Write an enzyme that holds these catalytic residues in place. Structure first.
Site, PDB file in Angstrom:
ATOM      1  N   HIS A 128       0.804  -1.214   0.000  1.00 14.04           N
ATOM      2  CA  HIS A 128       0.000   0.000   0.000  1.00 14.04           C
ATOM      3  C   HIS A 128       0.836   1.263   0.000  1.00 14.04           C
ATOM      4  O   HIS A 128       0.332   2.323  -0.385  1.00 14.04           O
ATOM      5  CB  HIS A 128      -0.897   0.047   1.246  1.00 14.04           C
ATOM      6  CG  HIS A 128      -1.660  -1.213   1.501  1.00 14.04           C
ATOM      7  ND1 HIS A 128      -1.311  -2.105   2.490  1.00 14.04           N
ATOM      8  CD2 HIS A 128      -2.768  -1.717   0.909  1.00 14.04           C
ATOM      9  CE1 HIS A 128      -2.166  -3.119   2.482  1.00 14.04           C
ATOM     10  NE2 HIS A 128      -3.064  -2.900   1.540  1.00 14.04           N
TER      11      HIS A 128
ATOM     12  N   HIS B 106       6.025   6.916   6.232  1.00 17.74           N
ATOM     13  CA  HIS B 106       5.673   6.438   4.910  1.00 17.74           C
ATOM     14  C   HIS B 106       5.081   7.614   4.147  1.00 17.74           C
ATOM     15  O   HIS B 106       4.902   8.709   4.688  1.00 17.74           O
ATOM     16  CB  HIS B 106       4.656   5.298   5.019  1.00 17.74           C
ATOM     17  CG  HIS B 106       3.387   5.736   5.645  1.00 17.74           C
ATOM     18  ND1 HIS B 106       3.191   5.716   7.007  1.00 17.74           N
ATOM     19  CD2 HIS B 106       2.293   6.312   5.107  1.00 17.74           C
ATOM     20  CE1 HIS B 106       2.007   6.231   7.280  1.00 17.74           C
ATOM     21  NE2 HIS B 106       1.441   6.611   6.145  1.00 17.74           N
TER      22      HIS B 106
ATOM     23  N   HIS C 274       2.152   8.955   0.873  1.00 24.20           N
ATOM     24  CA  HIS C 274       1.039   8.793  -0.048  1.00 24.20           C
ATOM     25  C   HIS C 274       1.331   9.697  -1.236  1.00 24.20           C
ATOM     26  O   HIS C 274       1.807  10.820  -1.053  1.00 24.20           O
ATOM     27  CB  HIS C 274      -0.269   9.211   0.623  1.00 24.20           C
ATOM     28  CG  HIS C 274      -0.546   8.489   1.911  1.00 24.20           C
ATOM     29  ND1 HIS C 274      -1.346   7.371   1.979  1.00 24.20           N
ATOM     30  CD2 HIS C 274      -0.104   8.710   3.174  1.00 24.20           C
ATOM     31  CE1 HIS C 274      -1.396   6.939   3.228  1.00 24.20           C
ATOM     32  NE2 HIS C 274      -0.645   7.728   3.977  1.00 24.20           N
TER      33      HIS C 274
ATOM     34  N   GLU D  53      -3.241  13.477   1.019  1.00 19.53           N
ATOM     35  CA  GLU D  53      -4.473  13.065   1.679  1.00 19.53           C
ATOM     36  C   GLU D  53      -5.189  14.289   2.235  1.00 19.53           C
ATOM     37  O   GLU D  53      -6.314  14.587   1.844  1.00 19.53           O
ATOM     38  CB  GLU D  53      -4.145  12.028   2.743  1.00 19.53           C
ATOM     39  CG  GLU D  53      -3.506  10.773   2.118  1.00 19.53           C
ATOM     40  CD  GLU D  53      -3.710   9.552   2.946  1.00 19.53           C
ATOM     41  OE1 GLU D  53      -3.269   9.514   4.108  1.00 19.53           O
ATOM     42  OE2 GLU D  53      -4.330   8.603   2.420  1.00 19.53           O
TER      43      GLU D  53
ATOM     44  N   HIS E 237       3.911  10.985   6.198  1.00 17.56           N
ATOM     45  CA  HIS E 237       3.374  10.771   7.531  1.00 17.56           C
ATOM     46  C   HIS E 237       4.462  10.198   8.412  1.00 17.56           C
ATOM     47  O   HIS E 237       4.924   9.070   8.189  1.00 17.56           O
ATOM     48  CB  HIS E 237       2.209   9.787   7.466  1.00 17.56           C
ATOM     49  CG  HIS E 237       1.007  10.380   6.819  1.00 17.56           C
ATOM     50  ND1 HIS E 237      -0.050   9.649   6.313  1.00 17.56           N
ATOM     51  CD2 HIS E 237       0.716  11.682   6.614  1.00 17.56           C
ATOM     52  CE1 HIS E 237      -0.927  10.500   5.796  1.00 17.56           C
ATOM     53  NE2 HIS E 237      -0.495  11.734   5.985  1.00 17.56           N
TER      54      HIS E 237
ATOM     55  N   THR F 192      -5.544   6.829   8.117  1.00 15.02           N
ATOM     56  CA  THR F 192      -6.111   7.057   6.793  1.00 15.02           C
ATOM     57  C   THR F 192      -6.186   5.792   5.955  1.00 15.02           C
ATOM     58  O   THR F 192      -6.647   5.851   4.814  1.00 15.02           O
ATOM     59  CB  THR F 192      -5.344   8.122   6.044  1.00 15.02           C
ATOM     60  OG1 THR F 192      -4.014   7.644   5.827  1.00 15.02           O
ATOM     61  CG2 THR F 192      -5.339   9.444   6.794  1.00 15.02           C
TER      62      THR F 192
HETATM   63  O1  LIG Z   1      -2.434   5.390   5.780  1.00 12.75           O
HETATM   64  C1  LIG Z   1      -2.103   5.572   6.864  1.00 12.75           C
HETATM   65  N1  LIG Z   1      -2.150   4.356   7.779  1.00 12.75           N
HETATM   66  C2  LIG Z   1      -1.613   4.503   9.223  1.00 12.75           C
HETATM   67  C3  LIG Z   1      -1.606   3.348   9.995  1.00 12.75           C
HETATM   68 CL1  LIG Z   1      -2.275   1.824   9.286  1.00 12.75          CL
HETATM   69  C4  LIG Z   1      -1.116   3.517  11.284  1.00 12.75           C
HETATM   70  C5  LIG Z   1      -0.574   4.769  11.712  1.00 12.75           C
HETATM   71  C6  LIG Z   1      -0.709   5.868  10.958  1.00 12.75           C
HETATM   72  C7  LIG Z   1      -1.185   5.726   9.681  1.00 12.75           C
HETATM   73  S1  LIG Z   1      -1.376   7.101   8.843  1.00 12.75           S
HETATM   74  O2  LIG Z   1      -2.737   7.578   9.183  1.00 12.75           O
HETATM   75  O3  LIG Z   1      -0.307   8.062   9.176  1.00 12.75           O
HETATM   76  N2  LIG Z   1      -1.618   6.871   7.297  1.00 12.75           N
HETATM   77 ZN   LIG Z   2      -0.291   7.657   5.969  1.00 12.14          ZN
END
Ligand SMILES: O=C1Nc2c(Cl)cccc2S(=O)(=O)N1
Ligand SMILES: [Zn+2]
Ligand SMILES: O=C1Nc2c(Cl)cccc2S(=O)(=O)N1
EC number: 4.2.1.1
Length: 257
Positions: free
Chosen positions: A61, A91, A93, A103, A116, A195
């Site tokens: 993902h 990570h 997006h 996002e 993020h 998200t």
């Molecule tokens: O896509 C996202 N998935 C997350 C998961 Cl699964 C855990 C922690 C933070 C995030 S995030 O909201 O930063 N963006």
């Molecule tokens: Zn994220």
């Protein structure tokens, strides 16, 4: 099962994860004229000097860099936060074109990508427990626009060839996440969610106003990753973003005038 395709994307997630239609979902559009300066907010404290990165991995993902969070080494404090939040991963997006990928949006503007930096509240002991709490996580969100290169991103982009497909990981030690930060720590903040599934409503969002600039060559490398696993037909990992969700009974607060 969930993903970003027509038949498993964001509009489908609510069937497996009914909280997708909840009261504090993320991301959101940040209406800059409606966000109110909150003089009671404190300056952010981003203390990354002792960060210990471990691995980089393609999870099907996104791609994610992990950190040692067994000790207070890289922590986020202050701002809207009570207590100490440990960095555990970052990570991104991103989009298929430069005009989409983020996002969060700002006055409906989409950036090319969004970083993020994910932290968890140490009062809850481990991240799995933290995700069950309304104040369990703090995510520092940073917009990417396409322009000049970001030198601190290059070490990431140059290893992506080695994690092209879902399930691949590589050593990624000695990476300094301070090189991903813009100059200013001015931010917006609001209570929200993860998200992606499980969409847990456990996040204090801290979204920086100043984007970082990355080069077209850097973002093109993100777009060469694959959603698929090795020995399968290529499906390019692009447009791995959830659109803005209803703000509902929330206020977005600004740290700055
Ligand atoms: O896509 C996202 N998935 C997350 C998961 Cl699964 C855990 C922690 C933070 C995030 S995030 O909201 O930063 N963006
Ligand atoms: Zn994220
Ligand atoms: O990729 C990740 N997924 C998570 C989920 Cl699904 C729940 C909790 C924490 C995490 S994470 O942030 O450690 N990294």
């Amino acid at each position: 099962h969930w993903g970003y395709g027509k038949h498993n994307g964001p509009e489908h997630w609510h069937k497996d994860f009914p909280i997708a239609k909840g009261e504090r979902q993320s991301p959101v559009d940040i209406d800059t004229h409606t966000a109110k300066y909150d003089p009671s907010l404190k300056p952010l404290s981003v203390s990354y000097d002792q960060a210990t990165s471990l691995r980089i991995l393609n999870n099907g993902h996104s791609f994610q860099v992990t950190f040692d969070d067994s000790q207070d080494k890289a922590v986020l404090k202050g701002g809207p936060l009570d207590g100490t939040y440990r960095l555990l991963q970052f990570h991104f997006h991103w989009g298929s074109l430069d005009g989409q990928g983020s996002e969060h949006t700002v006055d409906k503007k989409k950036y090319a990508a969004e970083l993020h930096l994910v932290h968890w509240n140490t009062k809850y002991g481990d991240v799995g427990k933290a995700v069950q709490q309304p104040d369990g996580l703090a995510v520092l969100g940073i917009f990417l626009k396409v322009g000049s290169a970001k030198p601190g991103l290059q070490k990431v982009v140059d290893v992506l060839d080695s994690i092209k497909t879902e399930g691949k990981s590589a050593d990624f030690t000695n990476f300094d996440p301070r090189g991903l930060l813009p100059e200013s720590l001015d931010y917006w903040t609001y209570p929200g969610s993860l998200t992606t599934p499980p969409l847990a409503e456990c996040v204090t969002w801290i979204v920086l106003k100043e984007p970082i600039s990355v080069s077209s060559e850097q973002v093109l490398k993100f777009r060469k990753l694959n959603f698929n696993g090795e020995g399968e037909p290529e499906e390019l990992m692009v447009d791995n973003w959830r659109p803005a969700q209803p703000l509902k009974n929330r206020q977005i607060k600004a740290s700055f005038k």
